[PDB]
Design a binder for this molecule. Structure first.
Ligand SMILES: CC[C@H]1OC(=O)[C@H](C)[C@@H](O[C@H]2C[C@@](C)(OC)[C@@H](O)[C@H](C)O2)[C@H](C)[C@@H](O[C@@H]2O[C@H](C)C[C@H](N(C)C)[C@H]2O)[C@](C)(O)C[C@@H](C)C(=O)[C@H](C)[C@@H](O)[C@]1(C)O
Ligand SMILES: O=c1ccn([C@@H]2O[C@H](COP(=O)(O)OP(=O)(O)O)[C@@H](O)[C@H]2O)c(=O)[nH]1
Length: 384
């Protein structure tokens, strides 16, 4: 089959499904990938053929602030990009209409084209999705006042008119936030209101994902501290060193992203600017994490209890959810002192119920199935 994938040039909207694209190619499908030129090479590595289009969105290396800091500044760019991208893509595919459209959540043109072409669309979400009641519980209150401003009224009017020009009568919110079919590339454990998500629309597949690491001989408890790749806090690192430094039985791996700023280190502490995080987590008993999407899923994937110390807006939810699962404790940076970190660590690693819960979450993530399940489910949507 000819499967056409669509995304934007943003790491967090391309990296999550690259392996799925690779696997569909490996299985013998003809895969094309609508992508801005900066990500042509990234995409091509999968065996998919890049179909280039010009984007008006910030580049993949832009600061997070380039994407806006208000509701309308966040959403407007996706409509404006879509208005100018759609004709380029309609033109590109005109003589080679795909059998199935795959797309990241950010690509409105993919939605329009799938409908225009009369072919199935599968939305690939790298984050949480709407549950039943989301419209009344989250969307309506969030939009209530902005929608009534001249700017918000104009935005929705424009969006509706664009959809109507293209033969689409669905309300913009339905079109944007409510896909007919979706695969979700996070564990359902990190989905708010998971029991209320429509399983007829959404299927959770989890993350679709170097070097090794060896535990020091005789270490009873290994703790990894890693605040991810961006939001990486010297005072907190100092508290970590003080928490686990010279603590009998414990070995601390500290991922800092200067080692001098940390002071002289105890003998049971190893410091690195970068670590093979997954490799360490497979060999770790505790994970002190900022609760980013990757770290949170890897902690669960590896059944590693967590101290969640969220840094940025995108992490507080994950931290709350991890603690709610009974497999983590959330601390405010921040109050994350040596004494509290140590007590928290000791409580988590010794708790058999925490370990039971992690094992069950691992079992549940096994059922989600990742890359090869996502590929199986996509194939299942191919027309007869
Ligand atoms: C429920 C279903 C809805 O999903 C969300 O609410 C998730 C949970 C947002 O993240 C939430 C949560 C959070 C923390 O982002 C992960 C926050 O930053 C943003 C504002 O809203 C997403 C993904 C936002 O994207 C993010 O927008 C940022 C401006 C830049 C970021 N990027 C490219 C770097 C990008 O991923 C953004 C604006 O909603 C995407 C546009 C296309 C939408 O309006 C779409 C249609 C959504 O309404 C949705 C898919 O229907
Ligand atoms: O030293 C490091 C730092 C991070 N990572 C990986 O980088 C990703 C970080 O993603 P996350 O969403 O957790 O945090 P972000 O950097 O986006 O805030 C995860 O897959 C980590 O395993 C890694 O392998 N080694």
């Amino acid at each position: 089959a000819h499967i056409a994938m669509f995304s934007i040039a943003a790491h967090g909207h391309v990296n999550p499904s690259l392996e799925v694209i690779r696997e569909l190619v490996a299985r013998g499908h003809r895969v094309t990938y609508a992508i801005p030129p900066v990500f042509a090479d990234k995409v091509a590595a999968t065996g998919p053929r890049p179909v280039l289009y010009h984007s008006t969105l910030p580049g993949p290396d832009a600061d997070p602030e380039a994407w806006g800091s208000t509701l309308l500044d966040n959403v407007e760019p996706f409509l404006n990009d879509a208005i100018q991208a759609l004709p380029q893509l309609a033109d590109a595919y005109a003589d080679d209409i795909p059998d199935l459209v795959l797309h990241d959540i950010t690509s409105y043109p993919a939605r329009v084209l799938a409908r225009r072409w009369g072919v199935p669309a599968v939305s690939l979400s790298p984050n949480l999705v709407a549950w039943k009641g989301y419209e009344e519980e989250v969307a309506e209150p969030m939009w209530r006042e902005p929608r009534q401003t001249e700017r918000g009224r104009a935005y929705y009017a424009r969006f509706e008119a664009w959809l109507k020009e293209n033969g689409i009568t669905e309300h913009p919110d339905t079109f944007a936030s409510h896909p007919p079919r979706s695969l979700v590339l996070i564990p359902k454990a990190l989905q708010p209101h998971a029991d209320r998500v429509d399983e007829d629309v959404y299927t959770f597949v989890g993350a679709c994902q170097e070097g090794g690491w060896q535990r020091p001989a005789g270490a009873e408890k290994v703790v990894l501290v890693s605040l991810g790749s961006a939001f990486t806090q010297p005072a907190f690192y100092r508290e970590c060193v003080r928490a686990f430094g010279n603590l009998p039985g414990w070995h601390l791996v500290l991922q800092i992203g200067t080692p001098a700023e940390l002071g002289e280190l105890p003998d049971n502490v190893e410091v690195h600017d970068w670590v093979p995080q997954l490799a360490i987590l497979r060999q770790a008993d505790l994970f002190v994490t900022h609760a980013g999407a990757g770290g949170s899923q890897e902690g669960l994937a590896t059944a590693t209890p967590m101290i969640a110390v969220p840094q940025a807006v995108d992490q507080f939810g994950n931290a709350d959810m991890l603690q709610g699962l009974g497999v983590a404790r959330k601390l405010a940076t921040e109050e994350a002192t040596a004494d509290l970190l140590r007590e928290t660590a000791l409580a988590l690693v010794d708790d058999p119920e925490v370990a039971r819960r992690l094992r069950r979450i691992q079992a549940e993530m096994a059922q989600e199935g990742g890359t090869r399940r996502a590929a199986d489910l996509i194939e299942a949507e191919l027309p007869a």
